[PDB]
Amino acid sequence: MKAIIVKPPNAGVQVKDVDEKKLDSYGKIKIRTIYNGICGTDREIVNGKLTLSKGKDFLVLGHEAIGVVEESYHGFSQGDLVMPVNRRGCGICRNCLVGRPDFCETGEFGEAGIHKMDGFMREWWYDDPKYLVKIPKSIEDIGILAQPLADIEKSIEEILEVQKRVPVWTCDDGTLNCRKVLVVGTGPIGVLFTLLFRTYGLEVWMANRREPTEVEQTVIEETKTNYYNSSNGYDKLKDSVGKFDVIIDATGADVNILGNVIPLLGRNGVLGLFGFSTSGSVPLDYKTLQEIVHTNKTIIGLVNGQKPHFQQAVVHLASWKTLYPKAAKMLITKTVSINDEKELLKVLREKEHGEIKIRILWE
Amino acid sequence: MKAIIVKPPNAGVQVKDVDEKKLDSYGKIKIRTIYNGICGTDREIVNGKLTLSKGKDFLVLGHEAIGVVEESYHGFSQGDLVMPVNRRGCGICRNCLVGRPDFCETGEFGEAGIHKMDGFMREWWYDDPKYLVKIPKSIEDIGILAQPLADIEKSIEEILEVQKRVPVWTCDDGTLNCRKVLVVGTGPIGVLFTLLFRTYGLEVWMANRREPTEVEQTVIEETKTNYYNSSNGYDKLKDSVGKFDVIIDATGADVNILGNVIPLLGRNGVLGLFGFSTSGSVPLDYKTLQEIVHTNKTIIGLVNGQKPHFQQAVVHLASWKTLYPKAAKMLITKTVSINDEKELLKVLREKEHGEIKIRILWE
Amino acid sequence: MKAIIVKPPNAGVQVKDVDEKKLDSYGKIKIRTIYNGICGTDREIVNGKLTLGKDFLVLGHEAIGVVEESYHGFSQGDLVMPVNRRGCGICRNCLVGRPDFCETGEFGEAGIHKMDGFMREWWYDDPKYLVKIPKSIEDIGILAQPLADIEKSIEEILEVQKRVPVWTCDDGTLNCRKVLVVGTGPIGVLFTLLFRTYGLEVWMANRREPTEVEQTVIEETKTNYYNSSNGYDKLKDSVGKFDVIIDATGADVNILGNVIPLLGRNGVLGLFGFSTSGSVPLDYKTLQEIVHTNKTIIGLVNGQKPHFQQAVVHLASWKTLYPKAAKMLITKTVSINDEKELLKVLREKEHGEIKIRILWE
Amino acid sequence: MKAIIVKPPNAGVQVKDVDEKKLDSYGKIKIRTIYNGICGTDREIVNGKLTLGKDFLVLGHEAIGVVEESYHGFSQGDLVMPVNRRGCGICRNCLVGRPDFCETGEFGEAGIHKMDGFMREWWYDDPKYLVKIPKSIEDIGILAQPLADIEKSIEEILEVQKRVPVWTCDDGTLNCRKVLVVGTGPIGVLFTLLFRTYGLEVWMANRREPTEVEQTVIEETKTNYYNSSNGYDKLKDSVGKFDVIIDATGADVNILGNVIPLLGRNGVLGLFGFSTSGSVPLDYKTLQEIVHTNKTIIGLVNGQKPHFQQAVVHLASWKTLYPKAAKMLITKTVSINDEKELLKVLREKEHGEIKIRILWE
Ligand SMILES: [Zn+2]
Ligand SMILES: [Zn+2]
Ligand SMILES: [Zn+2]
Ligand SMILES: [Zn+2]
Ligand SMILES: [Zn+2]
Ligand SMILES: [Zn+2]
Ligand SMILES: [Zn+2]
Ligand SMILES: [Zn+2]
């Protein structure tokens, strides 16, 4: 069977034929892979940047997948498109046992194509129906985004759950339309946060240390989103716009995220950390925590969407085809054939500028 | 009228007779002061450490009070004991308008004896019944603690509201008894957090850079609370006990709270900041935020209890007289007469070692 | 100005020119009406079935209009829908923009009570009561108003079920949860579509075989159907009990007796429609059941602006997900100038009706 | 071993020596019984009013006992109370320690179903099902078991009311909210005490003037009272409508018809007791009311360990806050050795009864 394989924690990736007898099976339903997605986590593993590593000589890469059901089973018809949920439970703790290993208490969950579990960049795999999300054919083209968007659906749900601590966090009109969000860093993560917050009606500002890419300009225009070039810091944004109800660190590209953005966070506000710097140290002034304390601010770590969030992603992706057709059409950056080895190895190893999502097509 | 008066932002305090015509009235019910409490905020103002300051030459100090209703009004009988709520609304925002200025969006709320409002260290004051909490006579002796405990009731309520984001945060027995809390710093704040968490059934560890005071030993013994001397840091506590579900920075006595305690916080855990350092800077390693992100941790600023929390305080104080009589008896450190000027000025200006709560008696 | 007018509580309806100066204005934005929707409440008012210096009231609470000149957030040519129930100005719920929970009952209702409705050539409104309707859902966006009531109703039911320590399924979703929707028409169909969007298993029930639309819904959304002409025993035998039951149309005088035996442990009966006459025997065993198993009965009514905005998102989604069903929800469009056919549809529902639209031109 | 035994569904009860070897053991901690409580459910079982290789079942689900030897968290001499309903081992709710929401109905109930109860000299239990009873509430701590059901019921009602955007009052509390408690006895009195603890205004109602205890509660807790012998019209005229109504004792066959007209907008009717016979006319206007105003009816049952622990806190609080009421909740104590008087109180409630305790000695 053809697979894309890695050997963690070391650098390197191969697209080659492997013995299917050695590849992990997770249930009874046979699924033939049609698309994979690639993200930053894949690049890190490919480049041996995930310094963590059983009877296996290699691990099948990839946790973003759409496959076709090969034979009708229970509820699944031959030809149905499915996406597998990638983080799976530790089998022990109460969160995993209710289908929510995003909140696993032991840290012993499995992550397809990352840790403990062969991923989905292979011709086909067997799965358990309970880990499959149905992908309507009417979203086949952008449906691979359901996996990364699930993370964002869970992150926003959590933010809103947290904000129930505020006796009234709605606006004069009963909505959250008056609430302002700053999305720090774009790429597929910040773009997806922006689109989802705008879906929900909140005002959004996207920020990068640069002028907008073409996709970002389309998002700005079509979703009526604002943009801030933060190349010279955030003083001008605070002076013009003021403070934000929610700030999202989407890309972890600011070594001083707290110092830079807490001053921009408004009373009762939430800073959600999704990306984070992977090296360094910075000074922490005492005024940062004093301000958090005085105004009931919260900082929350944001990670991992689960099956309900995958299903919510599907619904939103479907809505965007009608609400934001121009932007939706721009989110798949390109599709590379599994048979184009040179171009495939290139996109596995490194992002391209402006990239939102690269898909791999199985042919 | 006799009052204790300050002149912010400058240092100094006087116990003297003042013209009652110039003192703030807040409604129709006449209340004769019987007790005041003193806390750290009073010491700061007295010592001109609150560097923030209208037609007034002075401000009546004090936001912790029990008074006696002077004449029967509506629902209040002559002789009834009452405590005033100290933070009051800005009159504009939606949180204030539902009686919750602890979440004020404008920051224009008033704080009795601190900012915009004469406090309650005066022979008597007029109030609005809606700002009064009924203090049962059966808790007259410790009832002054209802004000600081209200802050703690609101802080824990908020923590538990936040933890609803976790699909299951209860234990195998449906309780929170398996959940462990580290209370960093004692004094009246950390003692009250400890007693309340134990009321709720969670396991608690109190921590200071010293061996326990006598009151703390009584709490340890009577409430079955644990104790950790953190003089040499937290490594030995982590090695023996592991990690905590909630950590409370009660006293703000650690310039490196994040660095020191995030490593002790468990998956899905909450760090609640109630105290905070008032000067300095410390290094922030990147690993701190990476850990917050990976395990859905939250940091929350904790401040200000409101009327429902005052009423909850009353109920708990009543329960402690039965559940923890030894500790309850030790929480009022001493009572100083308004007529003992030397001893009164001394306790206004400085805390004593081991102090939980000093009461002023009006005679 | 041309308007469709009524004179509550008296029966009757007229399409006539009226004096624009005596009509209610609600803000600074002039909106030219393009579509109205008609529903059951309109039929009741027109037939004088409700008791609720103006000589008439402009009818209609379902509307889409076009902003005539740019003002603050709204541009010339934007499509907008007004929120129909508005606050009493006194209570805390209305003050946070939620008169669906009004504590005084003194809220206004456009085209019903204290407020001229939207079946008129144009009206002035306040941006705060306007919901933006994307051009991409112009054809079905009139449904955002009735859909809002359903959004609110489902939200409320899910909020109530947070009382259950774990109401999710082994996979973390609500996919294992079963809903019985009693009665279709626009209300039961909208409840069905929305519950299927959320992933719950749905059974639609009526005392008859499916309509053309219903069959489309069944097939396209994988929804189940039960003919209840001879009661529900056979449904209970074959599928067992339901986690949520919705009385959509209020067309069963014995709803409690007939459906509580089909409600499962910890289950919720949501009442949206209700019978408008009569008295029926309540057995003691009904309540005994309700008590032992933490069952809840909840009256469901009125969606507010956040629900209108959620409706917009879902309608957009159904154009992609359920295109065949979505194209069948608008039953017909009647011209404001076709007086004969207009009076006929105001006065009586047509068999099979989901939503009739009035076009202004 | 001496035990109080029954043989369900047959009527009757015996106090006799039984073979300890054939009795249920639930864990490693040996507990010597000191008190049992008796309630309505016990009277029903003894009179064979429930249909629910053992020849008998040990009766009793309300107990306090003393730990005989130290084991893990529990020391020799600690007072403990067992949680009486235990999980089915299959469903997600039971698996998170909440069989009050058991989805299979296959949970065990001590002294009722699948589990020997606690009216026996001693039993073995698992620390996970034991609630610590402080020595300082030994005299009234037997009430922690029925109080737990009330803790859970009020918690559930407040959870449900989070659906209301603002259900608090102008002062941020629930002080403005009014509760009508229909029926007293141990259930209505406990509901009353607990709602007053939370600060809500309470009216107790019965078809009679107050008992001695009730008058003490009225005065000491500032609770209101209504004689409902001639219906509730005069209550509605004088006070208006209620935000929460609790049917505590199920002693009104027309509860819905009689109290829904007294339930206010967004209000909740919580059903704890229920009628055990009969059929009554349900008018259509009842549901119409429920629908227009977001009313909810909720069946209330069974508290679990967190509720037992909350009960302990509140009982401790009432010793300080409401000492006179608290000293009147234990109606009498009957010796396990006074067989005549013991059989009499197992078989029938006494007039005025709140709680009868059995003492083991
Ligand atoms: Zn990825
Ligand atoms: Zn786990
Ligand atoms: Zn203080
Ligand atoms: Zn405010
Ligand atoms: Zn309508
Ligand atoms: Zn209102
Ligand atoms: Zn009982
Ligand atoms: Zn169960």
GROMACS .gro file of C-alpha atoms and ligand atoms in nm, chain B residues 89-97 100-101 103-109, ligand 4:
model
   19
  452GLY     CA    1  -2.274   5.069   4.015
  453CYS     CA    2  -2.179   5.326   3.748
  454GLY     CA    3  -2.550   5.367   3.659
  455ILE     CA    4  -2.472   5.322   3.290
  456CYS     CA    5  -2.357   4.973   3.193
  457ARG     CA    6  -2.563   4.651   3.165
  458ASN     CA    7  -2.370   4.469   3.446
  459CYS     CA    8  -2.424   4.754   3.691
  460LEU     CA    9  -2.787   4.776   3.591
  463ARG     CA   10  -2.332   4.343   3.939
  464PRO     CA   11  -2.071   4.629   3.933
  466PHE     CA   12  -1.830   4.325   3.625
  467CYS     CA   13  -1.874   4.697   3.549
  468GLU     CA   14  -1.782   4.772   3.183
  469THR     CA   15  -1.697   5.142   3.230
  470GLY     CA   16  -1.484   5.125   3.545
  471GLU     CA   17  -1.686   5.417   3.681
  472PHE     CA   18  -1.831   5.227   3.982
 1452ZN      ZN   19  -2.090   4.982   3.528
   0.00000   0.00000   0.00000
